[model samples]
Target: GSAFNGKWETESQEGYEPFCKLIGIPDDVIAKGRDFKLVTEIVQNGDDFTWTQYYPNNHVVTNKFIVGKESDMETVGGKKFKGIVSMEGGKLTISFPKYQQTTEISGGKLVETSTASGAQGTAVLVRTSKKVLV
Candidate 1:
């Protein structure tokens, strides 16, 4: 959650171009991605960020990163993003940005449904720690 808690190095990128191809990205862009460096950051307070650069030609670019609870994520550039993260056991479980899911059923039927009685996906990040008041 601190500024120093991020990985600011280009560790490794395997078959980088092929990965870009699988995603339908333009060849030119894939080339850029291959040349660029990748650095990701996840702040303790939930702020997230990514840094990248296109090598041999293009310029380096940094984009604002925002992280928050799953149900609180919003849409940007037609893509939904969320920061479902946690710090526990000396490690962090950071999930890929995800969109919030909406529930439609309501009223009496909801109480009788099996989904209601099943184990739900609780907020892992939030539940990872708790403040105790005595």
Candidate 2:
């Protein structure tokens, strides 16, 4: 899909840290992420997809999975979980143990939204990313 074959860089985000904390991210790490930028590279071949996330602090997280299949995924904090990925309504959605996230192409940019409900409260994180030519 067109949405899964581009390099996208974060332009802006809302409620990221709150959502991260709600998901049990450590304070120090969350602090680093607050001012850091992220680049997302996605490649798709048939039903298989690879997602590479680049962080400002020289951290990278890569995951490869097939659509409609479950795979082992790791969060930014190095926590592992089983993730079931699917694509529907022109959106790619991934469901993890604690939260679910959806990504779509909107206005030539990648819009990713993550929502989770915990005792801390309901948190939503929205990240808007612009495509990178390279």
TM-score of 2: 0.88
At residue 115, what lDDT does model 1 achieve?
12
Off by over 4 Å in 2: none
97: Cα error in model 1, Å = 7.9
Number of clashes in every candidate structure?
1, 0
Query: Per-residue lDDT for 1-134 in model 1, tens only?
Result: 34323334333334444433443458987665564544322223434534232233433343344443443333322344544544343333334333122211122111100111113332211111111111
CA lDDT of each candidate? 0.33, 0.84
Each prediction's TM-score versus the true structure: 0.39, 0.88
